[PDB]
Amino acid sequence: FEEEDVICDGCNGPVVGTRYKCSVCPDYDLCSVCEGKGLHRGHTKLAFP
Ligand SMILES: [Zn+2]
Ligand SMILES: [Zn+2]
């Protein structure tokens, strides 16, 4: 079966916990650490569990 893996665009680490996905870009996500450092805040994001 096919598996979806989310990798953080800031640090290339796996997104464990909350996923901050850009609503503008295709396929841009941040982990909570990179989100907390303020990456990519020129675009609205969705934060899902
Ligand atoms: Zn990260
Ligand atoms: Zn974006």
Numbering used by the authors: -3 to 45
Which passages does the manuscript contain on this structure?
However, an understanding of the manner by which the ZZ-domain binds to type-2 substrates is problematic since there is no deep hydrophobic pocket in the ZZ-domain, which is known to be involved in the recognition mode for type-2 N-degrons. Therefore, we determined the structure of the ZZ-domain in complex with a variety of N-degrons comprising three type-1 N-degrons and five type-2 N-degrons. As described for the R-BiP complex, two aspartic acid residues, Asp129 and Asp149, bind to the α-amino group, and Asp147 forms a hydrogen bond with the first peptide bond, which means that these interactions are conserved in all different N-terminal residues. However, the side chain of the N-terminal residue of the N-degron is recognized differently. Furthermore, the hydrophobic side chain of Ile127 guides the orientation of the side chain of the primary residue. Furthermore, the phenyl ring of the phenylalanyl peptide is properly oriented for van der Waals interactions. Our structural information clearly explains the affinity measurement data as well as previous pull-down assay results showing that type-1 N-degrons and only a subset of type-2 N-degron peptides (Phe, Trp, and Tyr) displayed binding affinity with p62.
